[PDB]
TrEMBL record, chain B:
GO terms for cellular component: cytosolic large ribosomal subunit. Belongs to the eukaryotic ribosomal protein eL13 family. GO terms for biological process: translation. Keywords: Ribonucleoprotein, Ribosomal protein. Signal peptide: none annotated. It comes from the Eukaryota. It comes from Chaetomium thermophilum (strain DSM 1495 / CBS 144.50 / IMI 039719) (Thermochaetoides thermophila). GO terms for molecular function: RNA binding; structural constituent of ribosome. This is 60S ribosomal protein L13.
Automatic annotation (TrEMBL), chain C:
The lineage of its organism: Eukaryota, Fungi, Dikarya, Ascomycota, Pezizomycotina. Residues 1-22 are annotated as: Disordered. Component of the pre-66S ribosomal particle. Belongs to the NOP16 family. It comes from the Eukaryota. The chain holds residues 3 to 60 of 237 of the full protein. Involved in the biogenesis of the 60S ribosomal subunit. It is found in: Nucleus, Nucleolus. This is Nucleolar protein 16.
From TrEMBL, chain E:
The keyword Cell membrane does not apply. The keyword Ribosomal protein applies. GO terms for molecular function: RNA binding. Component of the ribosome. Residues 70-157 form the Ribosomal protein eL8/eL30/eS12/Gadd45 domain. This is 60S ribosomal protein L8. It comes from Chaetomium thermophilum (strain DSM 1495 / CBS 144.50 / IMI 039719). One of its GO terms (cellular component) is cytosolic large ribosomal subunit. Belongs to the eukaryotic ribosomal protein eL8 family. GO terms for biological process: ribosome biogenesis. Keywords: Ribonucleoprotein, Ribosomal protein.
UniProtKB/TrEMBL annotation, chain G:
Belongs to the STT3 family. Belongs to the universal ribosomal protein uL29 family. It comes from the Eukaryota. Catalytic subunit of the oligosaccharyl transferase (OST) complex that catalyzes the initial transfer of a defined glycan (Glc(3)Man(9)GlcNAc(2) in eukaryotes) from the lipid carrier dolichol-pyrophosphate to an asparagine residue within an Asn-X-Ser/Thr consensus motif in nascent polypeptide chains, the first step in protein N-glycosylation. N-glycosylation occurs cotranslationally and the complex associates with the Sec61 complex at the channel-forming translocon complex that mediates protein translocation across the endoplasmic reticulum (ER). This is Dolichyl-diphosphooligosaccharide--protein glycosyltransferase subunit STT3. The chain holds residues 5 to 125 of 935 of the full protein. Coiled coil: none annotated. It is found in: Endoplasmic reticulum membrane. It comes from Chaetomium thermophilum (strain DSM 1495 / CBS 144.50 / IMI 039719).
Length: 74, 117, 58, 183, 196, 84, 121
RNA sequence: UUGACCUCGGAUCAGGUAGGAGGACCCGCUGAACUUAAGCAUAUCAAUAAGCGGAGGAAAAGAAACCAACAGGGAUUGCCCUAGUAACGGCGAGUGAAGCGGCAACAGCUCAAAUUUGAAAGCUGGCUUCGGCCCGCGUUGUAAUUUGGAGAGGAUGCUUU
RNA sequence: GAAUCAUCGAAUCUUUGAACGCACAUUGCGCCCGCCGGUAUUCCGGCGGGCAUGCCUGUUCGAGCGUCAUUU
């Protein structure tokens, strides 16, 4: 059991003796991302999750980030 | 000269008609805002510099401050009536001055100026 | 790429952006040029019919 | 016209009155912190010439940088290293410019002018509201200060051909194979 | 033994260094300020020509506004601001110049005694830039000047001009050119004898 | 099964000493006394002074928690800082 | 089972709190007796859950409208009541700040503005 | 004893800001080796890839300490040719621009150095019925005027809001 | 006024994560303010708002024979 569960990325890649995740580097503020492996980036880019907030931005820009209510609404 | 990676820095021009129609719609949109106004500005007649091109004139950047004064056109009104001004250029000869002053009087004759508000 | 594959699988609408341009292609108002401007003609034959000059260059 | 007198005195900086002041200030700056703050500029004529005003939103910071080589030489200037260290400290502020204030055998001392883009005096003033825009985030990291414009060769002439628009942009332009439709 | 705070030690060691290191005559002339009697007489005249504060200027403008609804001479105030004052002494409009001894960048006033002496205006050097800011209704004033006073006290300024000249100016005349330093104590003397 | 301390739980939460009330209010002693006259704050008596504070004396005076909290939110306390 | 949103906007805050009171209690007793013979009770439970969600939305809506009427004169609004926009749209210069110009450039533009003209053919 | 001014700190005081993501394009730092020369080390690869820092819808550059030698041109940027030219080199492999000219697009400006001195005229706060009150910043300089193919000051008489 | 409808300007938004009271592999361990229920001013449990770092402007508090004035 060299590696344990990582809090941030959820993989079993957190080294137990060093307390550093080999996939994302959890104690570091930045997520680990190297350019010599494109395949590892398409496993973690924006778009591989659920888009809880980023998916609702484009509709708000379509209407000019409108604030208020429709006129004569109840 | 195929010594470096030419494949990763090759630019193709399939958008040449696409850029052309975009360029024409930019000129179209420029005259939409400036509707009675022309789409360009007045440029002076300028003599090409080197001995290879001494005998051909072209369009320069803007008129000399002395060229505006001889034609009776004020310097702080000239950019507002569509005349480009260049303070770097000098006359150095009466032939360059007389040719461009005559150009400004011809622009003055063809001009329709509208009264403020 | 992983972005676009998520949208196809999702039951969320594709936000269709209307064709809005920064600059209007035609003059507008109640001036003389706006009333006599032809939408289908181009700049040069519009200024031909007006009697004006569009380009002062060569 | 007190600053014209200061300009002539700053030119003469090995002379007796100024070398005395540069000696006693270097002793004081050595025993302070590396990236400490200055309530007033030590050279008010150089701060004024570089864009500093006595307005809320303008601060001055003093930095000590280690001098010497990196026989490899660090292509970043010591002013550019000084400017990068203020911005990483005062991450809410924008690096306007910097100037030399002192020297030693181990350290060089610089004073850096910072502008607060989130104050209301700054946003109201159209002479400095340009720095409020998001294009000017971390100018010292992109070589956009006077030191960076020098080290990037941003001058005009036959003497600065390779670097007058950016050498990486010029190298991309000169190494691009341009193929047209009707070749 | 006990440990002093860092800024306490630094500002105290700046005392000892200023009194130990021997100072060039440009900065050394600031160590010779005037006496208690001449300060009080100068500030007696100068308090009479204080500028108007923000309250009584706003009321004075309110005077002329409400009278316009329902004739002045030249105001005479003490002049301040470095570039304003040194512009006045360069144009020989100043009668008397009073310079603080504690401008934290000393270069802003280090040319002032020579410029006043070249131009012919008699000057003086006083303790406290805070004392000059009191006259000015600011926090600190690096320098003040007097240009013209009313005819009530043309004589009082003339006697003060002389008293500054024969009481301060012809007493520091030899010390303008001479260097500072030479305040070595018993510990410094024994240390220098051990080093030599 | 949880371990709970007798010092932290009981009458010590309810009643507070005069010195602790002054330190909490961050006011001087004459300022605290004057605010007691105006607001009608009263020292009162706890049931067990030893349970309120183990190190305590009968000469010492205690205070209730709620009226101290009223003095913490007093506009007079804000007015005292403005007048000072 | 279902409470229409039309009548909820009429009633005040205290009367809504009674409906909120009976709604979960009826849900709770239903859920106890739903674990045996979960038939049309299960359709009713769904009607209870939507009705609870509908009155909570109406209770919240009149609450912040009352808060916004309180804060219509003060400068600093609370964090939840402020509009979202984006991060960069919030740090963008204001419309009055980005449009204002120097006095020396206003004096120039007043007396020498861009005139309107045409050139004959 | 009192009260400054200067400097250094504290506060779960009020109001804000920075981190991370993305990185196709953009600005910097740092920086290889394989290959070629039928071996190979200068060179080349390459001021590239990998590594680090930092922005925007574009970025960057930009209104000459410019190019020119002409009858001169006239901020920046990009395309076409210049041109595989000049120039540099185990002068082998090779490397390799620019001015001019034709176009695309064009737009100019802000300070510092001046005494408003017959009046700090400037600005942040937070308290308001909001109409205008104080606090602070600031003379070690905040507004106005001015930025060298200029300008200021007087006089002068027309023309502008 | 149906809808596994469309639009979308108002809300809700658990634990984490730049991740922010401390710990984290436990639905644990602390402090300030307020509320509720169960014998309840003392006991227990739950809930609500808060409590990271660097920096800027202001507010307030403090230190320094650094330093000025103080017999009219
Ligand atoms: Zn991980």
């Amino acid at each position: 059991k060299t590696h344990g569960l990582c809090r941030r990325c959820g993989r079993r890649s957190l080294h137990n003796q060093k307390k550093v995740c080999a996939s994302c580097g959890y104690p570091a503020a930045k997520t680990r991302k190297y350019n010599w492996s494109e395949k590892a980036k398409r496993r973690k880019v924006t778009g591989t999750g659920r888009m809880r907030y980023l998916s609702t931005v484009p509709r708000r820009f379509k209407n000019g980030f409108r604030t208020g209510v429709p006129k004569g609404a109840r | 000269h195929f010594r470096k990676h030419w494949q990763r820095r090759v630019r193709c021009h399939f958008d040449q008609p696409g850029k052309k129609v975009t360029r024409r719609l930019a000129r179209r949109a420029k005259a939409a805002a400036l509707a009675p106004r022309p789409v360009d500005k007045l440029r002076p007649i300028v003599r090409c510099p080197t001995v290879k091109y001494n005998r051909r004139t072209r369009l320069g950047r803007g008129f000399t401050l002395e060229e505006l004064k001889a034609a009776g056109i004020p310097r702080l009104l000239a950019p507002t009536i569509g005349i480009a001004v260049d303070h770097r250029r000098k006359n150095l000869s009466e032939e360059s001055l007389a040719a461009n002053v005559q150009r400004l009087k011809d622009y003055k004759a063809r001009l329709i100026l509208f009264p403020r508000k | 790429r992983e972005l676009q594959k998520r949208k196809r699988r999702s039951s969320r609408p594709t936000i269709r952006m209307p064709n809005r341009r920064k600059k209007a292609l035609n003059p507008a108002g109640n001036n003389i040029i706006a009333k006599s401007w032809n939408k289908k003609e181009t700049l040069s034959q519009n200024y031909t019919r007006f009697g004006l000059v569009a380009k002062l260059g060569k | 016209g007190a600053l014209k007198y200061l300009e002539e005195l700053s030119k003469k900086k090995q002379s007796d009155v100024v070398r005395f002041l540069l000696r006693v200030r270097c002793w004081e700056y050595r025993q302070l912190n590396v990236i400490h703050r200055a309530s007033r500029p030590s050279r008010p004529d150089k701060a004024r010439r570089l864009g500093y005003k006595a307005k809320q939103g303008y601060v001055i910071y003093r930095v000590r940088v280690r001098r010497g080589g990196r026989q490899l030489k660090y292509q970043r200037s010591l002013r550019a290293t000084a400017e990068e260290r203020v911005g990483r400290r005062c991450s809410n502020l924008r690096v306007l410019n910097s100037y030399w204030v002192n020297q030693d055998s181990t350290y060089k001392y610089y004073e850096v002018i910072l502008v607060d883009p989130n104050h209301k005096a700054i946003r109201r003033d159209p002479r400095i509201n340009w720095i409020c825009n998001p294009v000017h985030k971390h100018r010292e990291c992109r070589g956009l200060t006077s030191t960076g414009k020098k080290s990037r060769g941003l001058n005009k002439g036959h003497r600065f051909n390779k670097t007058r628009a950016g050498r990486r942009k010029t190298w991309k332009r000169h190494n691009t194979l341009s193929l047209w439709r009707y070749r | 033994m006990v440990k002093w705070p860092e800024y306490i030690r630094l500002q105290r060691q700046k005392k000892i260094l200023r009194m130990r290191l021997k100072v060039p005559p440009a900065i050394a002339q600031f160590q010779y300020t005037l006496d208690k009697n001449l300060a009080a007489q100068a500030f007696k005249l100068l308090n009479k020509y204080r500028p108007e504060t923000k309250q009584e200027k706003k009321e004075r403008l309110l005077r002329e506004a409400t009278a316009i609804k329902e004739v002045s001479k030249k105001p005479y105030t003490v002049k301040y601001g470095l570039n304003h004052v040194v512009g006045l002494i360069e144009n020989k409009k100043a009668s008397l110049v009073l310079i603080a001894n504690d401008v934290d960048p000393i270069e802003l006033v280090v040319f002032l005694p020579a410029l006043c002496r070249k131009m012919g205006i008699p000057y003086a050097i006083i303790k406290g830039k805070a004392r000059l800011g009191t006259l000015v209704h600011k926090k600190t004033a690096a320098v003040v000047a007097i240009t013209e006073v009313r005819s009530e006290d043309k004589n009082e300024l003339a006697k003060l001009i002389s008293a500054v000249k024969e009481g301060y100016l012809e007493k520091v005349e030899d010390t303008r050119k001479r260097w500072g330093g030479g305040i070595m104590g018993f510990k410094a003397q024994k240390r220098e004898e051990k080093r030599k | 099964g949880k371990a709970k301390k007798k010092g932290k739980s009981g009458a010590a939460r309810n009643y507070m000493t005069r010195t602790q009330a002054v330190k909490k209010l961050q006011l001087s002693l004459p300022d605290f006394r004057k605010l007691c006259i105006w607001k009608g704050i009263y020292p009162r008596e706890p049931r067990d002074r030893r349970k309120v504070n183990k190190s305590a004396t009968a000469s010492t005076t205690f205070y209730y928690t709620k009226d101290i909290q009223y003095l913490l939110h007093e506009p007079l306390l804000q007015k005292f800082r403005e007048q000072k | 089972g279902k409470v229409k949103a039309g009548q909820l906007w009429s009633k005040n805050k205290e009367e809504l709190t009674k409906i909120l009171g009976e709604l979960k209690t009826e849900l709770s007793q239903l859920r106890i007796q739903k674990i045996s013979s979960s038939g049309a009770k299960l359709n009713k439970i769904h009607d209870l859950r939507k009705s609870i969600a509908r009155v909570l939305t109406v209770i919240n809506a009149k609450q912040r409208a009352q808060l916004r009427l309180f804060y219509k004169n003060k400068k600093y609004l609370p964090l939840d009541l402020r509009p979202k926009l984006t991060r960069a749209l919030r740090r963008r210069l204001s419309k009055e700040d980005a449009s204002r110009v120097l006095e020396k450039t206003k004096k120039r533009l007043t007396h020498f503005p861009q005139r309107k003209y045409a050139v004959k053919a």
